[PDB]
Amino acid sequence: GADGVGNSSGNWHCDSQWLGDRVITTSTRT
Amino acid sequence: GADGVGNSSGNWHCDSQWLGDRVITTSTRTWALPTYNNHLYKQISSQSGASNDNHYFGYSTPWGYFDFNRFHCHFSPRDWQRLINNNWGFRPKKLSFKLFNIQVKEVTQNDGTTTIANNLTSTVQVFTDSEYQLPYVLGSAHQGCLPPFPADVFMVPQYGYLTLNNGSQAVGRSSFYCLEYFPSQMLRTGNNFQFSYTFEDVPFHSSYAHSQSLDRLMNPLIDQYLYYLNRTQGTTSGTTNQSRLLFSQAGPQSMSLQARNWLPGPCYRQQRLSKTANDNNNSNFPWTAASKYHLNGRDSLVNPGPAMASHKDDEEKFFPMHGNLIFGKEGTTASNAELDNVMITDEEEIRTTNPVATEQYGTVANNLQSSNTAPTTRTVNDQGALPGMVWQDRDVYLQGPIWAKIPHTDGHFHPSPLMGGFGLKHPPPQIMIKNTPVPANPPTTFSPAKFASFITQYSTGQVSVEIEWELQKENSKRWNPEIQYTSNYNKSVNVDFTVDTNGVYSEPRPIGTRYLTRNL
Amino acid sequence: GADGVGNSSGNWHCDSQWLGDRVITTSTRTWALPTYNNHLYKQISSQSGASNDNHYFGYSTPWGYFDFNRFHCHFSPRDWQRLINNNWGFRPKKLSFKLFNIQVKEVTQNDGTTTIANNLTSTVQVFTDSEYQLPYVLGSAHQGCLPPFPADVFMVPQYGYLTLNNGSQAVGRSSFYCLEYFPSQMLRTGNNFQFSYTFEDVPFHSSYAHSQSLDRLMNPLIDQYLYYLNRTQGTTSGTTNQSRLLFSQAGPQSMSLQARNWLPGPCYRQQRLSKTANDNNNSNFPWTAASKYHLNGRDSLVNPGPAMASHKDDEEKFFPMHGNLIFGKEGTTASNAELDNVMITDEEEIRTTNPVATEQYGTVANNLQSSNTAPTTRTVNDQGALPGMVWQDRDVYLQGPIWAKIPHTDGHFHPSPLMGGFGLKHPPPQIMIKNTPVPANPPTTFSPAKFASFITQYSTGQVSVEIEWELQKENSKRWNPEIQYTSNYNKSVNVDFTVDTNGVYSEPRPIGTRYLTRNL
Amino acid sequence: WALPTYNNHLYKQISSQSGASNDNHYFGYSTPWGYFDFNRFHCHFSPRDWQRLINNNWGFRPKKLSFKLFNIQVKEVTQNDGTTTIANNLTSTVQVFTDSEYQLPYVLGSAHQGCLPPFPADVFMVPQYGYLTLNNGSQAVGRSSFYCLEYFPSQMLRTGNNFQFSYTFEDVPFHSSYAHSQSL
Amino acid sequence: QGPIWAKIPHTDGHFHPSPLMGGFGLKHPPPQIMIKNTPVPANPPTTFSPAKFASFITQYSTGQVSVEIEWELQKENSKRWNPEIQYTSNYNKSVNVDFTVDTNGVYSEPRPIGTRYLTRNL
Ligand SMILES: Nc1ncnc2c1ncn2[C@H]1C[C@H](O)[C@@H](COP(=O)(O)O)O1
Ligand SMILES: Nc1ncnc2c1ncn2[C@H]1C[C@H](O)[C@@H](COP(=O)(O)O)O1
Ligand SMILES: Nc1ncnc2c1ncn2[C@H]1C[C@H](O)[C@@H](COP(=O)(O)O)O1
């Protein structure tokens, strides 16, 4: 990825939901 | 390439992998560049009566330059080991030069505090002397190369050149060069510089040492069918036996008398020195007794002369007066350092093809012997070239020079860099660099006077050099093991080729290249 | 090829015919091979304190080898005549090696009678060093070549090689070679061996001699337009005539003073010897007064040095101290033979391009002459190479060496075999041969001990070598007849180049190659 | 290689000496057969090769195999008076076979001698085959096994005959031609 | 000069089936190759004998043998900066040459040779 100065290079993804068969854990920290 | 402010114009490429047939060395370092000569070209020259053999005339340029004419710039200690211990020979092939991540910081001394900030709108200028129109100042063992250790930062050297001179003065045929009269690419932050070069055909280096000798080349078991004269008088000496011409058939017994097909390499005798500071003469002779040449009535020391052996067997203490390259250990003043502070290189692998540097060359006749005259012998101290001579060149060490620009003259003999390496007609061109001058504050009234008030600023960024190396694999039917370079497995203080307690990389010893054996 | 017991695996091909443009020499001889070193590799070395310049270290191998590095191996006396008297020059082109009609005889000493019989189920082993991994021991004037006379039988020599050594001892960089670690073809009776080789590009030999001279190259009738200085003082000497600078225009009169474009070949002075055992000094100086070189602190005699002329005009009795190849007559001990038992070769055709071996080289200045100082002259005894020098190489004789393996070093000058012939990077590889060891009777109980009880046996058979030769025809506008080699038509005792009363071939004299004249 | 006639063309029952040792008791047989072995690295690698190998590779392993017997000669000896004469018995044969079904006791991999000489120029004597079986002291049990190598199909060779054999190693982990720079 | 392989015994269980003396543990290792001289009856009697034959002509066999083995290699991939230790011959002035025949033709292996000279991490 390649962008600029006043443009965030990512979002705050921190969440977890279940699939009954599996689970996805998303974590974001500073 | 063209991008923006908050976008890196390059990545950190520093690695090396092998192809068995060849090896690619990628190296990246961080560099810093000041403003040299205050944005000015200056005429430099020899001090008014300060020295005679050191007279000179030239100029100092506001430009800096990049250099990596050292093997340790590209190979790591380990890689160099693999290379040395496995290959008959090797050579340079391709080249990739890259400049990126440029930042121009301008500094201001306000009160008693130096503040440094970003001057984004400022540029830097690069160009490569590919037409070879600027004096080639590389291949002279100068400093300012790329750091052996990748983590180290370096300062970009300044460009200065010499010209024809008559003492402290110059001749009308001298030449003044302005690097501003060269088209150069100017770069802002986010701009990068690209360059690709292709090495010419140049003979592999000798990463080998001969297991045979010049005089020990024949068959130990069979006798020659040729005859030589070995007795001029000594007969059945008793009665009436003055003299008689007697010839012998060469045998394994007459080993140093047999007919020969080849001669040793040329020579230029060097003075013998001992490392023991008491074997030597109690006199200062590093100039009045050393071998030197002179041009235009100017003495110059013949430092790395023709390739000659350092010492004969069973000595290993007598080195030639500057008969080899000497490297200075890390942290050691440039002025009169101790013997235990330098690393002297031993050229004892070329004993079989080359004459000993300090020893003589041989015997020559110089009279018409007869009943009236006794035969005379002359000790030859200097030998030009001869039909039938065969020699091995010097050696390259992990920290030695790589290439050298063969001078553009009417004639050359065996154009191999005396300091060692690859002699190139057209070597990796010079890459120049300089901070674009920024005028400080100008007056509201017009001034014809030369501008000399500039904003103080320095540049910084990364540089990347990729080189491909062709390899010559080893094909020997030697039964017993050959000698290999290795680290001392013993319990040790510091680790060879490593940083210390306060972060300083240090190269313990010089590294030869000749560990593998090939015949004659 | 693969056939049976009662079927010859080859024919006797020995003949030579001419193509006017080239000549093919076919040669076949009968060979015999013993069991060398008792099926063992032995470490050989110099005697514990027997000699100093003759120290050595190497090994003795159970293998034999084939050699034909002598011209008389291929050319007959007559052919050599045609060749010499007709061609400007010549060279090697192709090669065909063939082994056949092999028979393995095993011998047993029963009581007081040696019985010899056939061991059909026994084999012999051949292989050719084409990768040049075994020390090249050929081109050293060794004996064991093919017999000059076709009817003669020869013994196949033994292979022995030398290595790097430190006196009587060896270095860790020395090399041990086992010829068993080479893939070899094993042959039973009815098997044969085949091999084809192709010579590289190598300059024709000089089967000619110059009719002009270096200094006698200009025009006898016209004067030069160049000027030289010939008078420094001698003026109209009488009144007030101390000195004056006077120049003359070169004329046919000032023949040895005219401007020159070229120089003679290099030189390395040799001592002058007389064939008359009374002209000489009453002292034994064949080592203490002879020209020699030294490597690694080891003296070696410079036998066939640079190509220099043997004697000046009107002498023909003074030969250089080993300044040429000397051949031994048939039937003459290897230890101190008489002067009337050897054949010394005269190099008196190269007088026009080469300096005299025993004589000096010339005059050199070595001071700044003036009113205060008298001009000084130095007799030059040793001259390296120089821009503008031109020389002729040595000569090849009917019984001289043919080729020589140019050593694999970093550098060579004028890589022509000092003993004469064709210098080859890749010369006709070495062909090895040895009788496959046959275990004698073994014990019913197992023994880990090295086996050393073998059946005694020797091999025999024929060998064939075919060589093609490219020729350089003669194109001269010489009006008068040139000199030709010829036999003495006079009533004679024995016939030149022939067997005697009890069957022994003998080569009367050495045969030069330079009988035809070409200009400069 | 050289091969004698072992056990005088006879299979012999061997066993422990009647009360000579206790932890060394044994029972087996001695066969008239010899065998080939090269279960030593120096049989294949030269000193130099071994160096290249060692100094360059993380690890290594065996893959394929090619066995060949040739140039066979059968010499018969006769002691006439006080002189041993040796000659050629062309019409005589030799017998080879390979235990590929692994039915004969595997006697290799026991550090025995008789391998191929480290040095190529050296000649060696072909060892003799002998095997052991279940034993109760100096005696044997009923469950012991007697093997006759003659009950195996074997190829007989005259002079000019040769023997051929190809084998393929199974999957076996590389050897550690390395040493750890870290510790546990 | 060490062993190469070893036949893993055919039992109900093994743990870490590596030859204790070192090398490659093989379920099915290079089979055994047998050799023997075919018995040749000496001179027989004109009268028939049921007795076991034990009079043979004394004879021995000889010839060549060839063994070709292919070896898979695992190359070295280390980012070690400083040099590693290597096996080498003593470059010093020496008596006899390591791994060589002597004055009367006897090959001799000076020292044992390890295999572990290169370093890898954990
Ligand atoms: N480093 C290097 N570069 C180029 N040539 C080398 C070098 N070292 C040795 N030589 C030799 C190889 C050629 O035979 C010869 C050409 O010389 P010339 O004067 O060009 O005819 O110079
Ligand atoms: N016998 C023989 N073989 C090869 N070359 C010869 C010989 N005799 C003379 N020369 C000359 C011919 C080439 O001009 C030169 C090449 O030298 P180089 O050092 O190869 O550049 O050497
Ligand atoms: N030389 C040798 N041969 C085979 N396996 C080896 C060897 N050395 C170590 N191992 C290990 C590798 C497998 O993970 C394990 C299988 O054991 P198992 O009992 O087979 O389940 O044994």
PDB file of N, CA and C in Angstrom, chain D residues 124-158:
ATOM      1  N   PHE D 124      41.814 -56.104  -0.919  1.00  0.00           N
ATOM      2  CA  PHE D 124      41.220 -56.653   0.297  1.00  0.00           C
ATOM      3  C   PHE D 124      40.769 -58.107   0.150  1.00  0.00           C
ATOM      4  N   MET D 125      40.693 -58.801   1.280  1.00  0.00           N
ATOM      5  CA  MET D 125      40.217 -60.178   1.316  1.00  0.00           C
ATOM      6  C   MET D 125      38.739 -60.175   1.674  1.00  0.00           C
ATOM      7  N   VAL D 126      37.945 -60.941   0.933  1.00  0.00           N
ATOM      8  CA  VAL D 126      36.510 -61.006   1.186  1.00  0.00           C
ATOM      9  C   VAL D 126      36.213 -61.853   2.423  1.00  0.00           C
ATOM     10  N   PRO D 127      35.582 -61.240   3.438  1.00  0.00           N
ATOM     11  CA  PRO D 127      35.296 -61.862   4.738  1.00  0.00           C
ATOM     12  C   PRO D 127      34.458 -63.127   4.610  1.00  0.00           C
ATOM     13  N   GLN D 128      34.329 -63.872   5.702  1.00  0.00           N
ATOM     14  CA  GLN D 128      33.513 -65.080   5.710  1.00  0.00           C
ATOM     15  C   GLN D 128      32.203 -64.851   6.457  1.00  0.00           C
ATOM     16  N   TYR D 129      31.150 -65.530   6.015  1.00  0.00           N
ATOM     17  CA  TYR D 129      29.834 -65.384   6.624  1.00  0.00           C
ATOM     18  C   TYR D 129      29.648 -66.337   7.800  1.00  0.00           C
ATOM     19  N   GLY D 130      29.259 -65.778   8.939  1.00  0.00           N
ATOM     20  CA  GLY D 130      28.943 -66.565  10.114  1.00  0.00           C
ATOM     21  C   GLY D 130      27.822 -65.898  10.881  1.00  0.00           C
ATOM     22  N   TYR D 131      26.889 -66.696  11.385  1.00  0.00           N
ATOM     23  CA  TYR D 131      25.742 -66.138  12.084  1.00  0.00           C
ATOM     24  C   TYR D 131      25.465 -66.829  13.414  1.00  0.00           C
ATOM     25  N   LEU D 132      24.716 -66.146  14.271  1.00  0.00           N
ATOM     26  CA  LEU D 132      24.384 -66.656  15.592  1.00  0.00           C
ATOM     27  C   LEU D 132      22.899 -66.972  15.684  1.00  0.00           C
ATOM     28  N   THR D 133      22.517 -67.712  16.717  1.00  0.00           N
ATOM     29  CA  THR D 133      21.124 -68.075  16.917  1.00  0.00           C
ATOM     30  C   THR D 133      20.791 -68.089  18.401  1.00  0.00           C
ATOM     31  N   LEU D 134      19.518 -68.304  18.707  1.00  0.00           N
ATOM     32  CA  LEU D 134      19.060 -68.428  20.078  1.00  0.00           C
ATOM     33  C   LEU D 134      19.842 -69.541  20.770  1.00  0.00           C
ATOM     34  N   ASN D 135      20.306 -69.279  21.989  1.00  0.00           N
ATOM     35  CA  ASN D 135      21.077 -70.271  22.737  1.00  0.00           C
ATOM     36  C   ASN D 135      20.795 -70.278  24.240  1.00  0.00           C
ATOM     37  N   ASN D 136      20.946 -71.451  24.849  1.00  0.00           N
ATOM     38  CA  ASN D 136      20.819 -71.601  26.292  1.00  0.00           C
ATOM     39  C   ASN D 136      22.159 -71.997  26.900  1.00  0.00           C
ATOM     40  N   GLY D 137      23.040 -71.017  27.055  1.00  0.00           N
ATOM     41  CA  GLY D 137      24.399 -71.284  27.483  1.00  0.00           C
ATOM     42  C   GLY D 137      25.232 -71.746  26.305  1.00  0.00           C
ATOM     43  N   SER D 138      25.860 -72.907  26.449  1.00  0.00           N
ATOM     44  CA  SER D 138      26.635 -73.494  25.363  1.00  0.00           C
ATOM     45  C   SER D 138      25.716 -74.278  24.433  1.00  0.00           C
ATOM     46  N   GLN D 139      24.525 -74.591  24.937  1.00  0.00           N
ATOM     47  CA  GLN D 139      23.540 -75.358  24.187  1.00  0.00           C
ATOM     48  C   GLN D 139      22.615 -74.460  23.380  1.00  0.00           C
ATOM     49  N   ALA D 140      21.785 -75.083  22.552  1.00  0.00           N
ATOM     50  CA  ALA D 140      20.814 -74.357  21.746  1.00  0.00           C
ATOM     51  C   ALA D 140      19.402 -74.795  22.107  1.00  0.00           C
ATOM     52  N   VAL D 141      18.423 -73.978  21.738  1.00  0.00           N
ATOM     53  CA  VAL D 141      17.024 -74.294  21.988  1.00  0.00           C
ATOM     54  C   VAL D 141      16.420 -74.927  20.739  1.00  0.00           C
ATOM     55  N   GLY D 142      15.248 -75.535  20.881  1.00  0.00           N
ATOM     56  CA  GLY D 142      14.559 -76.123  19.746  1.00  0.00           C
ATOM     57  C   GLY D 142      14.083 -75.079  18.753  1.00  0.00           C
ATOM     58  N   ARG D 143      13.975 -73.837  19.217  1.00  0.00           N
ATOM     59  CA  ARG D 143      13.508 -72.733  18.385  1.00  0.00           C
ATOM     60  C   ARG D 143      14.642 -72.078  17.595  1.00  0.00           C
ATOM     61  N   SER D 144      15.854 -72.606  17.731  1.00  0.00           N
ATOM     62  CA  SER D 144      16.990 -72.077  16.982  1.00  0.00           C
ATOM     63  C   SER D 144      16.808 -72.351  15.494  1.00  0.00           C
ATOM     64  N   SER D 145      17.570 -71.647  14.662  1.00  0.00           N
ATOM     65  CA  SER D 145      17.406 -71.748  13.216  1.00  0.00           C
ATOM     66  C   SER D 145      18.716 -72.036  12.479  1.00  0.00           C
ATOM     67  N   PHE D 146      18.681 -73.028  11.590  1.00  0.00           N
ATOM     68  CA  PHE D 146      19.832 -73.388  10.765  1.00  0.00           C
ATOM     69  C   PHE D 146      19.596 -72.953   9.323  1.00  0.00           C
ATOM     70  N   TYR D 147      20.540 -72.196   8.773  1.00  0.00           N
ATOM     71  CA  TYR D 147      20.386 -71.649   7.429  1.00  0.00           C
ATOM     72  C   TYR D 147      21.417 -72.186   6.442  1.00  0.00           C
ATOM     73  N   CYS D 148      20.927 -72.648   5.298  1.00  0.00           N
ATOM     74  CA  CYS D 148      21.789 -73.105   4.220  1.00  0.00           C
ATOM     75  C   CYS D 148      21.675 -72.163   3.028  1.00  0.00           C
ATOM     76  N   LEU D 149      22.775 -71.501   2.695  1.00  0.00           N
ATOM     77  CA  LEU D 149      22.777 -70.521   1.618  1.00  0.00           C
ATOM     78  C   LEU D 149      22.742 -71.178   0.242  1.00  0.00           C
ATOM     79  N   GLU D 150      22.775 -72.507   0.227  1.00  0.00           N
ATOM     80  CA  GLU D 150      22.702 -73.261  -1.017  1.00  0.00           C
ATOM     81  C   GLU D 150      21.248 -73.428  -1.424  1.00  0.00           C
ATOM     82  N   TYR D 151      20.347 -73.258  -0.458  1.00  0.00           N
ATOM     83  CA  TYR D 151      18.912 -73.359  -0.708  1.00  0.00           C
ATOM     84  C   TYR D 151      18.386 -72.024  -1.217  1.00  0.00           C
ATOM     85  N   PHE D 152      19.311 -71.145  -1.584  1.00  0.00           N
ATOM     86  CA  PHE D 152      18.971 -69.878  -2.209  1.00  0.00           C
ATOM     87  C   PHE D 152      19.384 -69.910  -3.668  1.00  0.00           C
ATOM     88  N   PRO D 153      18.486 -69.470  -4.556  1.00  0.00           N
ATOM     89  CA  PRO D 153      18.841 -69.321  -5.968  1.00  0.00           C
ATOM     90  C   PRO D 153      19.999 -68.344  -6.123  1.00  0.00           C
ATOM     91  N   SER D 154      21.080 -68.793  -6.748  1.00  0.00           N
ATOM     92  CA  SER D 154      22.243 -67.942  -6.956  1.00  0.00           C
ATOM     93  C   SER D 154      22.723 -67.993  -8.405  1.00  0.00           C
ATOM     94  N   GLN D 155      23.281 -66.881  -8.869  1.00  0.00           N
ATOM     95  CA  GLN D 155      23.814 -66.797 -10.218  1.00  0.00           C
ATOM     96  C   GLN D 155      25.264 -67.258 -10.235  1.00  0.00           C
ATOM     97  N   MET D 156      25.563 -68.234 -11.086  1.00  0.00           N
ATOM     98  CA  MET D 156      26.921 -68.737 -11.235  1.00  0.00           C
ATOM     99  C   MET D 156      27.626 -68.054 -12.402  1.00  0.00           C
ATOM    100  N   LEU D 157      28.864 -67.628 -12.175  1.00  0.00           N
ATOM    101  CA  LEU D 157      29.595 -66.857 -13.171  1.00  0.00           C
ATOM    102  C   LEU D 157      30.917 -67.505 -13.561  1.00  0.00           C
ATOM    103  N   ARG D 158      31.165 -67.564 -14.864  1.00  0.00           N
ATOM    104  CA  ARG D 158      32.448 -67.994 -15.395  1.00  0.00           C
ATOM    105  C   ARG D 158      33.234 -66.732 -15.725  1.00  0.00           C
TER     106      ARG D 158
END
